[PDB]
Amino acid sequence: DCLLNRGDMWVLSSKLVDTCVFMDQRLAFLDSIRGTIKGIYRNGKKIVSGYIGEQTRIIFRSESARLIFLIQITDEMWNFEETGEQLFQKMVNSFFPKIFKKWKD
Amino acid sequence: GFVPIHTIFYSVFHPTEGSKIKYEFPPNNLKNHGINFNTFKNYIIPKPILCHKLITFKYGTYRIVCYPVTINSPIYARNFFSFNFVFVFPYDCETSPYEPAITRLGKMFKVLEEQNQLLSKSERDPVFFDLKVFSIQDLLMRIFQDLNNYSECLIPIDEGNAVDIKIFPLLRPPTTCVSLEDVPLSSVNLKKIIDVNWDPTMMSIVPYIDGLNSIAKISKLSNSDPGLVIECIRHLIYYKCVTLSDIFQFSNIYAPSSLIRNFLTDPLMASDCQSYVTFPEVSKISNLPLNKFLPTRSCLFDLYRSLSQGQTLKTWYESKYMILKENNIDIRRFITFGLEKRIIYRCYSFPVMIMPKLSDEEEGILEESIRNAETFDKICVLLSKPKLEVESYLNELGEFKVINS
Amino acid sequence: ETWVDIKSPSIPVSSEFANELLPIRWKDVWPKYVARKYSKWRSFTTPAELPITISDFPSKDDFDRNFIFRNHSVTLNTDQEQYNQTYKDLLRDMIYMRLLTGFQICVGRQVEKIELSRTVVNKYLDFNQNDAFKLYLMIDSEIHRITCSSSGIIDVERYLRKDEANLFDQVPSYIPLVKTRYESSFRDAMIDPLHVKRESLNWNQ
Amino acid sequence: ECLPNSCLLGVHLVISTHSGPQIVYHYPPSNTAFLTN
Amino acid sequence: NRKKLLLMGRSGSGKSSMRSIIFSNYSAFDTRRLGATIDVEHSHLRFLGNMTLNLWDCGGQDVFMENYFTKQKDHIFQMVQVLIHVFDVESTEVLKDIEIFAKALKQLRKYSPDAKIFVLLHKMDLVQLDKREELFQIMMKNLSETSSEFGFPNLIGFPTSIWDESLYKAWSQIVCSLIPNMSNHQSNLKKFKEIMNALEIILFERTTFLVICSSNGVLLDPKRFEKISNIMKNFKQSCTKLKSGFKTLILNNNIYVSELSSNMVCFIVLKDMNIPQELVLENIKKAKEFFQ
Amino acid sequence: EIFFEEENFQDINKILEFDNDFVAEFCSPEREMCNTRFEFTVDNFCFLGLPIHVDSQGRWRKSEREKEDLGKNMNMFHVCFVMNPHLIEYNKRIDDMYQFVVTRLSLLLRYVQSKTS
Ligand SMILES: Nc1nc2c(ncn2[C@@H]2O[C@H](COP(=O)(O)OP(=O)(O)O)[C@@H](O)[C@H]2O)c(=O)[nH]1
Ligand SMILES: [Mg+2]
């Protein structure tokens, strides 16, 4: 729910050096931008808390982003799968409702 | 075949008068046929541990298939709204093909009810709702009649939703005991079945299928890994099109089977056998000496029964060569017709234990094949060498015997 | 290269090279040893930004095969230092403006190897302790390097990747039919989707 | 399929007293993961 | 020692709300999320350390109610000790409720006529305060006339709701009709009251916090038992927040609340305020093995 | 002994992600669905058995004191077999199991319950 530039992400990561964080910690940038540390990784283990150094590959995933869907309407959309379902029937009955339920959750 | 539906009805959970049959087609079929909605009412509308599952039970002589669905939201009265599209079949059938269709119908109507309350507002009763914050019968009629007549439906229920059900037969999974020494046949013409949607490997396997190419030979010819060839051959077996066979040699121990009387009891087997085993012209192979106009059906029947368990094909051909020369019979086609009709079989050869210097990998796979008691065919395929060289290599490695089973 | 040449679809995977079939620019979003079976729903629900850091860099032979060379020399005038803006602020603003287009800050082993074959490369930017920064940025169009000292003379060298025989001229024109939501007939699109591209910006101005 | 395979997973001894149905004895206490696979 | 209790009513009568609040430890606000009970929901609940309560939370909807008296009549209504019929005062079909109760009484008289019928007029908080007692008496006269027709000379009723403490009193008096050795408990409690010289000693249960017996059986509140039960339930739910369990409570060195055993909680109100705490605690600990 | 290993053990009160009370509930049918086959399928789990229910009288079949109390109080006992056959061999596996094991076992159990509890 806030627009960060790429340089804004770089500056926020630069401010997050030599400082230890933990899971679900609400960081703040410019007293309005809200963060959430949902995952700290080290040697293949999801540690509860970790230390952020100079060579830490910090990523900025977006929980409110613009999305583009490109559905192919082809001759195969009305074809039947081996179980007995059309592919567009799958698209409108199991992909979109599940992804909207997941997005709401 | 597909079993016809006996009775379709739509149950619903009324928050005051309980579970009941809201709509049913044909009308009053359950009461006329003896089915009572007071014995299995706890399975049609169950507690929410059995919900969202394909409940199927037996009631007398009728097998009942249903997919109960329960939606949890504060909008509905009592925080729940349960319904069930129940399908009833006679017990003495197979309800396997209709099960994914019933599950998908229940799932689709659950999705629509969660989206825009298509099934709850159709009751036209505010008792289903909290009250503080399309015809089902025609749809059931169309579903029942279209699944009884056409096994398909494109039934519209709204401006953007349609009940699209197609019923497919259930096919057995293919074998897993397919190896590199088995030649695949093709009972169907695979040239006209190829379309744009095929696997790239299965496109390449099709030209090299003629009843005499081994699976490793197909893999090497089409530049394919043997594993994907195995999977593609399994897929072709899955549709009942390709049947495996044996590599044809002149050192085989072909013997009559228990179906050799089918060459007399089948009116259309010997007639095709006359035309099948004959060369198109007077071929020169029917003119070579032993050492230096179509065939009679009785001759073919006498030649089929002349094989025995221990007489190799070389000995049988050099013991019966005037008959296969005057009648102009192709011996490979002669054997292949008998193998295809399952009237003769092959006694496999087993090198059980008791030359150029081959490589370390060759001797390693030779030892691994010997330890697993593999046939001479598999050893010959893996070493890419004939039977005599394999026998000489084994005799150099140790004493052994051949079992013709 | 944007693809790997598979000899045949019928041959199987050689060892485990499928995990190596990853985009170079987005390679840093995955962890070091966590399997990819977990990051399936996360790509759908919570899409990831393009990372600031890039762990790949061309070798010595690639700079001597298809590349060119330019030079910059920027230093803020006496008008801007009336405000609280020194050469460090200008360097920060320049790295800020190098981003927002697709650039990625280079740090790792290959960048150090190229720097030695010519001292310390930087990822972030701290103005208190350090007083001379050197850090590389790379996109497929061009590769930048920015160096600074106490003199305030910022040196920028850009290695533009030369186009290969005008790929945007070898493609036929393709004008589809686009029907929007408020329309009722399939009208004609006003832009060619194939011939529109992210142009190389004039970074000097 | 001529291969013999009696696909069995367990047995129950469910009795119905006047105080409600109850389970008296089921022999295999293993979970679904070991039994199905 | 298995006791079969039957909990019947009409749809939405609040039977599962009673079962949840009294036994399953749910708050009054948490009964709104409860779903509709399909058929009969059995609940095996252990009271004290020897009694077990087989409470049968019946459906109460029209199909379930018609199924109970036709096909399951030989299963639901045999070996039954206590019937708890729940009546809703918001219902507009009161005559149908009385007819259903008459059918239930007829079946119980036919099969197990030694039972004890209790009726609870639930949801008596939507009605105004002036007409609660009058409505309860008006419905209780008809229910007693109906009850006396199908055997069963006695029928005890309680105005109940989940937004007050009358539910605890009603369920306590329902449960206490099944507790064995009540006379021995009364005699031992009277002996302890005489020994400790206490004004009134009340004995509870540790889990459900229902009244079991009292020493007496300055004018005091006649509804003090249910209020103490509600206060102790609220205090237990408050002490669950501190990641521990309630053990003892002393008020003004005059009101002693202590865990008498692993299944009972004593409520002792003494007469003299000058008794030290240790003597009362020691006398409580001496009687801990006596009531076992 | 493989059923009691640490990696292959579940609680006694839970049977295949279901509680014991719920399984005892839905495997105990009414009178109309008793004394016959009980081929119940949930999801790739065919709960199969032959329930034996007492008649209108106390007769199980027609031609310590807690033990006698339970003998006079029990009205139905069920031997439920859990099967997971493939979808192509359901009508074979369930039919052969019920034909060769379940029917004879439940009939012998009903007979021995009828004579001497
Ligand atoms: N206002 C009020 N609502 C009650 C009371 N008792 C029960 N309810 C309501 O009853 C609903 C739950 O009913 P439930 O126990 O499932 O009815 P049952 O299935 O017939 O036993 C809840 O939403 C409560 O709001 C009461 O004393 N006062
Ligand atoms: Mg209920």
Q: E251 with E137, same domain?
A: no
Q: E53 with E174, same domain?
A: yes
Domain span holding position E161: 1-182
CATH number for the domain harbouring residue E207? 3.30.450.190
How many domains does the structure of chain E reveal?
2
CATH number for the domain harbouring residue E153? 3.40.50.300
Distances (CA, A) of B241 to B119, B236, B244, B312, B382: 45, 6, 10, 31, 27
Q: Which residues on F lie below 8 Å from B55 (Cβ)?
A: 40-42
Residue closest to B106 by CA, chosen among B64, B146, B68, B134? B68
Q: Which residues on A lie below 8 Å from C51 (Cβ)?
A: 57, 59
Is F26 buried (19+), middle (13-18) or exposed (0-12) by CB count in 10 A? Answer: buried
User: What residue spans of B29-78 are helical by DSSP H?
Assistant: 29-33, 41-44
Distances (CA, A) of B186 to B190, B191, B236: 7, 11, 9
Q: Do F38 and B55 touch (CB under 8 A)?
A: no
Contact F80, F47 (CB under 8 A): yes
In angstroms, rounded to a whole number, what is the distance separating the alpha carbons of residues F85 and F39? Answer: 13
Q: Which residues of A sit within 8 Å Cβ distance of C?
A: 5-7, 9-11, 13-14, 17, 41, 43-44, 46, 54-55, 57, 59-63, 65, 67, 99, 102-103
Q: Do E71 and F21 touch (CB under 8 A)?
A: no
For residue E33, give both structure tokens. 């999320």
State which of E165, E182, E199 marks the end of a domain. Answer: E182
E125 is in an annotated binding site: yes
Residue closest to B218 by CA, chosen among B238, B202, B197? B202
Residue carrying structure tokens 């079993």: B3
Hey, what amino acid is at B117?
Q
Q: Is B115 on the interface with A (CB under 8 A)?
A: yes
Q: E12 with E70, same domain?
A: yes
Is B212 buried (19+), middle (13-18) or exposed (0-12) by CB count in 10 A? Answer: middle
Is B19 buried (19+), middle (13-18) or exposed (0-12) by CB count in 10 A? Answer: buried
- Beta-strand relationship, E2-9 and E82-88: parallel
Q: E169 with E195, same domain?
A: no
How many CB atoms are closer than 10 A to CB E144? 17
In angstroms, rounded to a whole number, what is the distance separating the alpha carbons of residues E129 and E140? Answer: 18
Write b or e for each residue in E244-265: b if 16 or more Cβ atoms lie within 10 A of its Cβ, otherwise e. Answer: eebeeeeeeeeebbbbbbebbb
Residue closest to B184 by CA, chosen among B251, B247, B227? B247
Q: E40 with E131, same domain?
A: yes
The whole-angstrom distance between residue A102's C-alpha and the CA centroid of its chain comes to 12
In angstroms, rounded to a whole number, what is the distance separating the alpha carbons of residues A71 and A60? Answer: 28
Q: DSSP letter string over chain E? A: -EEEEEEEESTTSSHHHHHHHHTS---SGGGTT--PPPS-EEEEEEETTTEEEEEEE---SHHHHHHHTTTTHHHHTSS--EEEEEEETT-S-HHHHHHHHHHHHHHHHHH-TT-EEEEEEE-TTSS-GGGHHHHHHHHHHHHHHHHHHSS----EEEE--SSSSHHHHHHHHHHTTT-S-HHHHHHHHHHHHHHHTEEEEEEE-TTT--EEEES------TTHHHHHHHHHHHHHHHHGGGTS---EEEETTTEEEE--SSS--EEEEES-TTS-HHHHHHHHHHTTTT--
Whether E60 lines ligand 1, by a CB cut-off of 6 Å, is yes
In angstroms, rounded to a whole number, what is the distance separating the alpha carbons of residues B184 and B209? Answer: 7
How many CB atoms are closer than 10 A to CB F103? 13
Q: Distance between terminal CA atoms of chain D?
A: 20
In angstroms, rounded to a whole number, what is the distance separating the alpha carbons of residues A9 and C105? Answer: 12
Half-sphere exposure of C94 (CA within 13 A, CB side): 28
Whether E38 lines ligand 1, by a CB cut-off of 6 Å, is no
Residue closest to C114 by CA, chosen among C96, C141, C134? C134
How many CB atoms are closer than 10 A to CB B139? 21
For residue B251, give both structure tokens. 């050192």
In angstroms, rounded to a whole number, what is the distance separating the alpha carbons of residues E284 and E32? Answer: 41
Residue closest to E209 by CA, chosen among E244, E177, E165, E253? E165
> To test ligand 1's pocket by mutation, which of E7, E17, E120, E165 has the most ligand atoms within 8 angstroms of CB?
E17
User: C-alpha dihedral over E93, E99, E100, E104, to 10 degrees?
Assistant: 160
Nearest CA to ligand 1 atom 26: E123
This entry's atomic model was obtained through cryo-EM
Q: E212 with E87, same domain?
A: no
Residue closest to D15 by CA, chosen among B99, A87, F80, B219? F80
Rg, C-alpha atoms of chain C: 22
Ligand 1 nearest-atom number relative to CA E61:
20
Q: Which residues on E lie below 8 Å from B78 (Cβ)?
A: 12, 35-36
F18 → chain B, closest CA residue = B49
Query: Per the omega criterion (within 30 degrees of 0), is the bond before B173 cis?
Result: no
How many CB atoms are closer than 10 A to CB E25? 14
Q: E25 with E147, same domain?
A: yes
State which of E148, E182, E216 marks the end of a domain. Answer: E182
H/E stretch holding B85: strand B80-90
Whether E31 lines ligand 1, by a CB cut-off of 6 Å, is yes
State which of E182, E208, E243 marks the end of a domain. Answer: E182
In angstroms, rounded to a whole number, what is the distance separating the alpha carbons of residues B243 and B283? Answer: 30
Q: State the best of D14, D15, D19 to mutate against chain E, taking most chain E CBs within 10 Å.
A: D19
Q: DSSP letter string over B340-386? A: HTTSEE---EEEEE------HHHHHHHHHHHHTT--HHHHHHHHT--
Q: E140 with E210, same domain?
A: no
| Centroid of ligand 1 to alpha carbon of E14 (angstroms) | 4
In angstroms, rounded to a whole number, what is the distance separating the alpha carbons of residues C205 and C186? Answer: 42
Beta bridge partners of F105: none
For residue A2, give both structure tokens. 């806030």
Q: E239 with E286, same domain?
A: yes
In this structure, what are the phi and psi dihedrals at residue E73, rounded to the nearest 5 degrees? Answer: -70, -30
In angstroms, rounded to a whole number, what is the distance separating the alpha carbons of residues B63 and B43? Answer: 13
Q: E20 with E150, same domain?
A: yes
Three-class SS state of B187? coil
Q: E153 with E280, same domain?
A: no
Q: Do C52 and A6 touch (CB under 8 A)?
A: yes
Q: E229 with E153, same domain?
A: no
Contact E288, E203 (CB under 8 A): no
- Beta-strand relationship, E255-258 and E156-159: unpaired
Q: Which residues on E lie below 8 Å from D21 (Cβ)?
A: 42
Q: DSSP letter string over B263-300? A: HHH-TTTHHHHHHHSB-SS--GGGTS-S---PPPHHHH
Of the listed ligands, the closest to the CA of E15 is 1
Is E276 buried (19+), middle (13-18) or exposed (0-12) by CB count in 10 A? Answer: exposed
Hey, what amino acid is at E36?
A
Q: Do E71 and F31 touch (CB under 8 A)?
A: yes
In angstroms, rounded to a whole number, what is the distance separating the alpha carbons of residues F3 and F9? Answer: 6
In angstroms, rounded to a whole number, what is the distance separating the alpha carbons of residues B279 and B324? Answer: 11
Residue carrying structure tokens 């050799």: B260
Hey, what amino acid is at B323?
I
